[PDB]
Amino acid sequence: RSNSSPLQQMTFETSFQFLKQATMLGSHDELRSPSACLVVGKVVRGGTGLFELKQPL
Amino acid sequence: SCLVAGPHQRHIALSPRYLNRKRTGIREQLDAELLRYSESLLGVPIAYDNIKVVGELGDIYDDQGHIHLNIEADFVIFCPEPGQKLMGIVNKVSSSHIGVHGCFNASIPKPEQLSAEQWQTMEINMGDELEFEVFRLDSDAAGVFCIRGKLNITSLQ
Amino acid sequence: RITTPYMTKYERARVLGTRALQIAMCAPVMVELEGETDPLLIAMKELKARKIPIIIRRYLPDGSYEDWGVDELIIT
Amino acid sequence: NMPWRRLQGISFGMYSAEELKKLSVKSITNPRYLDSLGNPSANGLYDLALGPA
């Protein structure tokens, strides 16, 4: 409950209570957890994905 | 005068094949694919891109191979727009229509002339029987921008 | 300017992967390949020669970032 | 050539109930959804405006 990720926290347990909460509070998700990053099809923010590559022109 | 210049920012995704040769590739297909083709974002025939530059760096996005970047380009454009009385080449006289610079095609549907003037099949005569088959009054305000070969519907009233 | 000078293993992995995905998409190889058909072997050959024009953009936990060159990074 | 656009954030809120309208292709009224042979009955749950199933 003391967690800043609605997409996490609903991939764990009691997903409908945590969805009702996140919905009646307008709770915003930053897509920084591994779960929130695998739900919307992003690259996790640890290990190999932690930096850019920035090909110079 | 159709003289127009529009500075616009576009997003272009360059292939890794055009790394050493970018300016070549920034145009090969990604800008030269709508060469003076009607634009709907701004109402623009893209004559040619005078200059295409990038403000700084390029962002390769995770699994994708392409290099995404921003292009600040000035489109030199020829804008015939409502509020203008243009000209038109008279080549073929028809009841359906009356089909500039040999490349801008113009149309004139039937009920757009003065109805005082009656027509003959071989050629049509206007009020004072003066035959005019030459660049003259053509005021287009209804414009097609969808069909592959677009139109320029000209008026005289 | 304050992060470690070496290239972490995750950075090596991602740089090799990206250079290989570029080579495979018909990118010029600056390493004088010698008959190998693997783009990952070519990417390793390039990393060993210090010819990779990529900029590792290390992100700090508050949004601030630091841009390092793959050349200016001690590969172990 | 991928979409190139990425997501930064997802917020959960409640729909107005007046903006759900215009998020609606048609109102369904026929209870029996299965046709005599197994096809979609017009104005039922399975319809051809709610998409090809």
From Swiss-Prot, chain A:
Assembly with partners or alone:
Component of the RNA polymerase I (Pol I) complex consisting of 13 subunits: a ten-subunit catalytic core composed of POLR1A/RPA1, POLR1B/RPA2, POLR1C/RPAC1, POLR1D/RPAC2, POLR1H/RPA12, POLR2E/RPABC1, POLR2F/RPABC2, POLR2H/RPABC3, POLR2K/RPABC4 and POLR2L/RPABC5; a mobile stalk subunit POLR1F/RPA43 protruding from the core and additional subunits homologous to general transcription factors POLR1E/RPA49 and POLR1G/RPA34. Part of Pol I pre-initiation complex (PIC), in which Pol I core assembles with RRN3 and promoter-bound UTBF and SL1/TIF-IB complex.
In which family does this protein belong, per the annotation? Belongs to the RNA polymerase beta' chain family.
Write out the function statement from the record. Catalytic core component of RNA polymerase I (Pol I), a DNA-dependent RNA polymerase which synthesizes ribosomal RNA precursors using the four ribonucleoside triphosphates as substrates. Transcribes 47S pre-rRNAs from multicopy rRNA gene clusters, giving rise to 5.8S, 18S and 28S ribosomal RNAs. Pol I-mediated transcription cycle proceeds through transcription initiation, transcription elongation and transcription termination stages.
Comment on protein domains: The clamps form the DNA-binding cleft. The bridging helix crosses the cleft near the catalytic site and is thought to promote polymerase translocation by acting as a ratchet that moves the DNA-RNA hybrid through the active site.
Can you say what this protein is called?
Answer: DNA-directed RNA polymerase I subunit RPA1
Give the UniProt subcellular location, in the record's own words: Nucleus, Nucleolus; Chromosome
Designated gene of the protein: POLR1A
UniProtKB/Swiss-Prot annotation, chain B:
| Intracellular or extracellular location(s) | Nucleus, Nucleolus
Domain of life of the organism encoding this protein: Eukaryota
Q: Which tissues is it found in, per the record? A: Widely expressed. Expressed in all fetal and adult tissues tested, with highest expression in fetal lung, liver, and kidney, and low expression in all adult tissues.
Family as reported in the entry's similarity comment: Belongs to the eukaryotic RPA43 RNA polymerase subunit family.
The free-text function statement in the UniProt record for this protein reads:
Component of RNA polymerase I (Pol I), a DNA-dependent RNA polymerase which synthesizes ribosomal RNA precursors using the four ribonucleoside triphosphates as substrates. Through its association with RRN3/TIF-IA may be involved in recruitment of Pol I to rDNA promoters.
Q: How does it assemble?
A: Component of the RNA polymerase I (Pol I) complex consisting of 13 subunits: a ten-subunit catalytic core composed of POLR1A/RPA1, POLR1B/RPA2, POLR1C/RPAC1, POLR1D/RPAC2, POLR1H/RPA12, POLR2E/RPABC1, POLR2F/RPABC2, POLR2H/RPABC3, POLR2K/RPABC4 and POLR2L/RPABC5; a mobile stalk subunit POLR1F/RPA43 protruding from the core and additional subunits homologous to general transcription factors POLR1E/RPA49 and POLR1G/RPA34. Interacts with RRN3/TIF-IA.
Q: What is this protein called?
A: DNA-directed RNA polymerase I subunit RPA43
Swiss-Prot record, chain C:
Q: Which residues of the full protein are shown?
A: 51 to 126 of 127
Location in the cell: Nucleus; Nucleus, Nucleolus
List the keywords (alphabetical). Acetylation, DNA-directed RNA polymerase, Nucleus, Phosphoprotein, Transcription
Would you tell me the protein name for this molecule? DNA-directed RNA polymerases I, II, and III subunit RPABC2
UniProt lineage: Eukaryota, Metazoa, Chordata, Craniata, Vertebrata
Q: Signal peptide span per the entry?
A: none
Q: How does it assemble?
A: Component of the RNA polymerase I (Pol I), RNA polymerase II (Pol II) and RNA polymerase III (Pol III) complexes consisting of at least 13, 12 and 17 subunits, respectively. Pol I complex consists of a ten-subunit catalytic core composed of POLR1A/RPA1, POLR1B/RPA2, POLR1C/RPAC1, POLR1D/RPAC2, POLR1H/RPA12, POLR2E/RPABC1, POLR2F/RPABC2, POLR2H/RPABC3, POLR2K/RPABC4 and POLR2L/RPABC5; a mobile stalk subunit POLR1F/RPA43 protruding from the core and additional subunits homologous to general transcription factors POLR1E/RPA49 and POLR1G/RPA34.
For the keyword Lipid biosynthesis, the answer is no
Domain of life of the source: Eukaryota
Q: Which gene encodes it?
A: POLR2F
Q: What is its main location?
A: nucleus
**Which family does the UniProt entry place this protein in?**
Belongs to the archaeal Rpo6/eukaryotic RPB6 RNA polymerase subunit family.
Q: Please provide, in alphabetical order, the Gene Ontology terms of the cellular component aspect for this entry.
A: cytosol; fibrillar center; nucleoplasm; nucleus; RNA polymerase I complex; RNA polymerase II, core complex; RNA polymerase III complex
Q: Which GO terms describe its molecular function?
A: DNA binding; DNA-directed RNA polymerase activity
Its function? DNA-dependent RNA polymerase catalyzes the transcription of DNA into RNA using the four ribonucleoside triphosphates as substrates. Common component of RNA polymerases I, II, and III which synthesize ribosomal RNA precursors, mRNA precursors and many functional non-coding RNAs, and small RNAs, such as 5S rRNA and tRNAs, respectively. Pol II is the central component of the basal RNA polymerase II transcription machinery. Pols are composed of mobile elements that move relative to each other.
Can you cite a GO biological process for this protein? transcription by RNA polymerase I
**Species name:** Homo sapiens
